[PDB]
Amino acid sequence: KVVIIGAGFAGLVAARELQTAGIEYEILEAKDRIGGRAWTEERMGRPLELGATWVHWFQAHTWTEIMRYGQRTEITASPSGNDAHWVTDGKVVKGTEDDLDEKLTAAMGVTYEGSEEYFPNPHDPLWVLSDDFDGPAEVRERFLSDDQTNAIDLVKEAGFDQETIDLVDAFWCAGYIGDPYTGSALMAKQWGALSDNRYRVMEDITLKWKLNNGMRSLYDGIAGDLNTDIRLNTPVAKVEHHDNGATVTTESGEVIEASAVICTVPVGALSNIEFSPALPDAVQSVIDDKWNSQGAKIWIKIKGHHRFLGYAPKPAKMSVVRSEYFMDDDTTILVGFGYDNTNIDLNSIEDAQAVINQWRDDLEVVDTTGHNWVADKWAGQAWGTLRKGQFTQGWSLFDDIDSQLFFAGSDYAYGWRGVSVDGALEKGMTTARQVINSMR
Ligand SMILES: Cc1cc2nc3c(=O)[nH]c(=O)nc-3n(C[C@H](O)[C@H](O)[C@H](O)COP(=O)(O)OP(=O)(O)OC[C@H]3O[C@@H](n4cnc5c(N)ncnc54)[C@H](O)[C@@H]3O)c2cc1C
Ligand SMILES: NCCc1ccc(O)c(O)c1
């Protein structure tokens, strides 16, 4: 009787949690596939992650699933010690990956500033605004001010030179997967807090360890535990929600009565669903504005074996590009993150060559691929990231619903919110507990 909308990680783990509690559920998924914004698929001669890729044992929810489904030793680190290239004042500078990481490390010290005062428990991100806050008034003032400041301006205001500004510009075009200048610096500070306030840990957690058997070994594992078949090709068109239950209408017009609805549809796709009554004004403002995830992820194949790292600031097609696989036919597959899905065609060899040409003139693209999540009706974004003001008046507002409609998904997590499968597994599970506790 609980209707779960979406068979991504949040919906899958919510279903398994309800099953443990003996609560009847049904998952309605719009696509002909499960996994959502995690999607492992054979492309260009090997399995590639069209979305979620990296994991770490400091991510509690992701790591427990890795252990559960047999993947404990099935992780491999991305290539390191690459030849680094970065664009700063319209020119390419070359150095070692260590050289680049040293410059980023110094910049992150200033970027994280305040995280120890804001986030003593890094899983209580809004503690500063709670009745339990006991620090000085100036800490709350700076906290609210930091929600209206982007992460690049912090580095500018600290007097770093143009090279470091261009490096963090590139870095946060990837990290905010969108225009970093519209973003909330509090997101970066909480990443620091969850990473022991050290750049190397933050990169170890978010950009190092890959699953040999893909995210699909995890989402297929969870679905394999479910005793109720997932209803694929069943998009939800309408949710009527009240204090004692809900009514869901599918695209085909099927009406399904529910004791509760767990909605995992991301903000970028919520406009496909009619809500009755309308969602609160403050939540609608977030949906209208959207998150700060307008960017895109590409996979590029070049001739030869090349250990390559490239950084480029806005408005480049791609801001962070790195070698990921050395193939048996003398080619290299690289990953890339960009700030603007509309400035690159992920499947155009000419655009992929333009990306590589940002740094080198001697590397030849032979293949390219990707899925433009922002142009995907059922996503409408990449990973969720925060605009100015959305740390304190954004993701947490989706919990302020009186009815039996519950919003779950990575974008509303307390921890590795938006950016990580960890946040989807966190919030899917805890939202199921909200439903369980209410029924108990
Ligand atoms: C490019 C990219 C790279 C990423 N890389 C990483 C990484 O390296 N590491 C990491 O930990 N995380 C990564 N992530 C984040 C991770 O993919 C997400 O945090 C997580 O997968 C989101 O899960 P979810 O269940 O909250 O949402 P989703 O996966 O979006 O699930 C929502 C589901 O609802 C379905 N749906 C939508 N609308 C409807 C409707 N009307 N009716 C029915 N069903 C509907 C969708 O098809 C989808 O299956 C990445 C994300 C992107 C976009
Ligand atoms: N999977 C992307 C997560 C990510 C992307 C870019 C960054 O610069 C970063 O620290 C983290």
Q: Is the Cβ–Cβ distance between 207 and 335 less than 8 Å? A: no
> Is residue 22 in a domain?
yes
Structural domains in the chain (count): 1
> Cα 316 from chain centroid?
21
> Is residue 237 in a domain?
yes
The rounded distance, in Å, linking the Cα atoms of 440 and 429 is 16
Could you tell me the CATH number of the domain that includes residue 239? 3.50.50.60
Verify cis geometry, omega within 30 degrees of 0, for the bond prior to 277: yes
Query: Ligand 1: distance of its center to the CA of 273 in Å?
Result: 17
Closest CA to 186 of 266, 133, 268, 127: 127
Mutate to test the pocket of ligand 1, among 37, 271, 294 (most ligand atoms within 8 A of CB): 37
> Is residue 107 in a domain?
no
The rounded distance, in Å, linking the Cα atoms of 176 and 179 is 7
Q: Is the Cβ–Cβ distance between 155 and 110 less than 8 Å? A: yes
Pocket flag, ligand 2, residue 52 (CB < 6 Å): no
> Is residue 348 in a domain?
no
Measured by CA distance, the residue closest to atom 7 of ligand 2 is 175
The rounded distance, in Å, linking the Cα atoms of 391 and 407 is 17
Atom of ligand 1 nearest to the CA of 7: 49
Tell me the residue length of the chain: 440
Closest CA to 6 of 195, 264, 200, 245: 264
Helix H segments across 113-215?
A: 115-118, 137-146, 151-157, 162-175, 185-194, 199-206
Closest CA to 51 of 376, 429, 413: 376
Query: Ligand 1: distance of its center to the CA of 8 in Å?
Result: 6
Residues 6+ positions from 191 with CB-CB distance below 8 Å: 175, 202, 206, 419
Please give the residue range of the domain that contains residue 240: 2-74+214-279+401-439
Pocket flag, ligand 2, residue 209 (CB < 6 Å): no
Residue type, 39: W
Full DSSP string of 319-385: SEEEEEEEETTTEEEEEEEES-GGG--TT-HHHHHHHHTTT-SS--EEEEE---GGG-TTT-SSS--
The rounded distance, in Å, linking the Cα atoms of 437 and 440 is 5
Strands 405-407 and 260-263 come out as parallel
Tell me which method was used to determine the 3D structure.
Answer: X-ray
> Cα 249 from chain centroid?
29
The rounded distance, in Å, linking the Cα atoms of 353 and 198 is 34
The rounded distance, in Å, linking the Cα atoms of 406 and 169 is 36
What are the structure tokens assigned to 185, written together? 């610096």
Å resolution of this model? 1.5
Buried/exposed code over 385-411 (b: 16+ C-beta within 10 A; e: otherwise): bbbbbbbbebbbbbeebebbbbbbbbb
> Is residue 90 in a domain?
no
> Is residue 89 in a domain?
no
What are the structure tokens assigned to 348, written together? 């155009």
Closest CA to 50 of 312, 379, 401, 270: 379
> Is residue 65 in a domain?
yes
> Is residue 18 in a domain?
yes
Phi, psi angles (nearest 5°) of residue 261: -125, 125
